[PDB]
Amino acid sequence: PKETTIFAMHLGKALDPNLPVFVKAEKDTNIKLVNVASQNQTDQIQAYNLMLTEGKLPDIVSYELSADLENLGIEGGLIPLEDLINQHAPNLKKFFEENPRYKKDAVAVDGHIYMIPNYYDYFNIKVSQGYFIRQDWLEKLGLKEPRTVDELYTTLKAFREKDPNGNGKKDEVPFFVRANNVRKVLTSLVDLFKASPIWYEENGMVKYGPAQKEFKHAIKELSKWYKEGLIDEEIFTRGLESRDYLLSNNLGGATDDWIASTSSYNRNLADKIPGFNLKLVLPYELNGNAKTRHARTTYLGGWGISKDAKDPVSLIKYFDYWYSVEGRRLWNFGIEGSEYTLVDGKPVFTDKVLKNPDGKTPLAVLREVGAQYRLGAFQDAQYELGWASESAKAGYKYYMDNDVVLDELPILKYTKEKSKEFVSIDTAMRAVVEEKAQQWILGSGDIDKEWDAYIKRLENLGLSKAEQIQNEAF
């Protein structure tokens, strides 16, 4: 083949086209990808901004920030795909016919399609993160299961002070999160206090979570929990390895994280830590409120074909390949005879995935062969149900049955008059939020003295204009 250039990062890692999934895709489609993001880049947003200054765009642009990606299309950097799809992408075309909601997510406000989203299998699994606590630490120490935020605070204090891992050292990390940027840290910390670090919907108004009184109260409580030693001291400096590191060393008491992979640890660690029992509870109640805002969106990011691509028909065929039964199965499941075998026509995972010798979660084993690499694919809940423990599957139903999960805001799209403006204000407000929230949590300053000055900064940045744009797009 010739070479196809791509910008693609995911979870801090530039796509390696020599992973088995992409080796197989190259064999099946004759596209040989070359990534213009280097293996040293770890921050997708910084790498994407650098990529935009380096001359020709790569043939394929993949990005997690889908309003920014669409903005690149509005400005001519990505081409419209709807006619390429109609002529040359029968798998996509049929996908759009059968999934009218997913079709709407692909269409920009001007009626062009500029990216194929990376879709979750949203109509089969919408829940995502839940709350987990060490049942076995509860039992070793005599405690009832906390049901409220203030009972949790008291339980975590007991995890910090009364040595539940029985080694005589004060090493317990009562509450921890899994994240590779400040926004993901905040997502997993402030939902506990019913706040949000992003936009959300409330009585048909779209609101900026970091400007709300709930957020101020969240940062103020988190401040106090951090200073007391209840929240991981290194919460802002670890990366995606935190969960694995803290559970496998028996340091971690409690977290807020994705149900299937977090549930997988009872089996992962059953021999390393006898009695290990990290158990899912419903969101803790805060003054009556028992809801969480953790839910899946219909998609996360996407990819599109740049205006510098020399051959768009063969790239829309590459996009389409991932929507065929074989390409979609390859993206979700890895390699036949390695990650899965076909039993009665259907993929069933092998024990390399299900029972990894070395303490790896099933998902982490799949990501090592290049499966589930966020691009523009259609995730398949059968892959997730294929490795989820029985307690994960009981976990999904427990959250749905109890109506604790507030549905995520639809991913909003902007007119060409507003999209540049919206995305600039969001970015600038985000930096102020992440810098103040991190400095408040860690103990500098005083959020009660500094709050109004903070809100005025977000307003100077264009908060009201951003709320207007949001509400009109809603």
Ligand X SMILES: CC(=O)N[C@@H]1[C@@H](O[C@@H]2OC(C(=O)O)=C[C@H](O)[C@H]2O)[C@H](O)[C@@H](CO)O[C@H]1O
Binding-site sequence positions for Ca(2+): 163, 165, 167, 169, 171-172
Query: Which of ligand X, Ca ion, none interacts with 163 (beta carbon under 5 to 8 A by kind)?
Result: Ca ion
Nearer to ligand X, 258 or 318 (CB): 258
> Binding residue for Ca ion (CB under 5 A) from 35, 165, 264, 297?
165
- CA distances in angstroms from 330 to 13, 32, 302, 334, 467, listed in the order given: 20, 16, 18, 5, 41
Nearer to ligand X, 86 or 124 (CB): 124
Query: Which of ligand X, Ca ion, none interacts with 31 (beta carbon under 5 to 8 A by kind)?
Result: none
Nearer to ligand X, 143 or 385 (CB): 385
Nearer to ligand X, 258 or 276 (CB): 258
> Binding residue for Ca ion (CB under 5 A) from 39, 53, 142, 169?
169
Q: Is-contact 384 127, C-beta < 8 A? A: no
Nearer to ligand X, 159 or 319 (CB): 319
Q: Is-contact 4 59, C-beta < 8 A? A: yes
Quick one: how many helices (H) and strands (E) in the chain?
22, 15
Q: Is 120 helix (H, G, I), strand (E, B) or coil?
A: coil
Closest distance between ligand X and the C-beta of residue 220, in Å?
A: 26
Query: Which of ligand X, Ca ion, none interacts with 260 (beta carbon under 5 to 8 A by kind)?
Result: ligand X
Closest distance between ligand X and the C-beta of residue 131, in Å?
A: 14
Nearer to ligand X, 66 or 118 (CB): 118
Q: Is-contact 178 188, C-beta < 8 A? A: yes
Query: Which of Ca ion, ligand X, none interacts with 188 (beta carbon under 5 to 8 A by kind)?
Result: none
Q: Can you say whether the dihedral through the CA atoms of 424, 430, 435, 440 is positive or negative?
A: positive
CA distance 166 to 312: 61
CA distance 245 to 227: 22
DSSP per-residue letters across 135-175: HHHHHHHTPPPP-BHHHHHHHHHHHHHS-TT-SSSS--EEE
Which one-letter amino acid corresponds to residue 80? P
Q: Is-contact 22 367, C-beta < 8 A? A: no
Closest distance between ligand X and the C-beta of residue 398, in Å?
A: 15
Nearer to Ca ion, 163 or 467 (CB): 163
What own/partner pairs with CB < 8 Å and gap ≥ 24 does 347-353 have?
347/382, 347/383, 347/386, 348/386, 349/386, 349/387, 353/387
Closest distance between ligand X and the C-beta of residue 383, in Å?
A: 7
Closest distance between ligand X and the C-beta of residue 144, in Å?
A: 28
The answer to the question of residue 167 lying near Ca ion (CB under 5 A) is: yes
CA distance 370 to 217: 41
Q: Is 183 helix (H, G, I), strand (E, B) or coil?
A: helix
Give the closest residue to 57 by CA, choosing from 313, 312, 307: 307
Closest distance between ligand X and the C-beta of residue 239, in Å?
A: 10
Count of residues engaged in binding Ca ion, rule: CB under 5 A: 5
Nearer to ligand X, 207 or 296 (CB): 296
Other beta carbons within 10 angstroms of residue 419's beta carbon come to 24
Closest distance between ligand X and the C-beta of residue 397, in Å?
A: 15
> Binding residue for Ca ion (CB under 5 A) from 16, 150, 151, 163?
163
Query: Which of Ca ion, ligand X, none interacts with 165 (beta carbon under 5 to 8 A by kind)?
Result: Ca ion
What own/partner pairs with CB < 8 Å and gap ≥ 24 does 74-77 have?
74/108, 74/110, 74/114, 74/416, 74/419, 74/420, 75/420, 76/307, 77/52, 77/306, 77/307
For the annotated binding site, the residues are 163, 165, 167, 169, 171-172
Q: Which stretch binds Ca ion (CB under 5 A): 104-112, 127-135, 159-167, 404-412?
A: 159-167
Return residues touching ligand X (CB under 6 A): 118, 184, 258-261, 300, 363, 372, 374, 384
Closest distance between ligand X and the C-beta of residue 299, in Å?
A: 9
Query: Which of ligand X, Ca ion, none interacts with 306 (beta carbon under 5 to 8 A by kind)?
Result: none
Chain breaks after residues in the chain, where C lies over 2.5 Å from next N? none
Q: Which stretch binds Ca ion (CB under 5 A): 105-113, 162-170, 340-348, 398-406?
A: 162-170
Give the closest residue to 379 by CA, choosing from 320, 326, 433, 331: 331
Query: Which of Ca ion, ligand X, none interacts with 169 (beta carbon under 5 to 8 A by kind)?
Result: Ca ion
Residues of this chain that interact with Ca ion (CB under 5 A) are 163, 165, 167, 169, 171
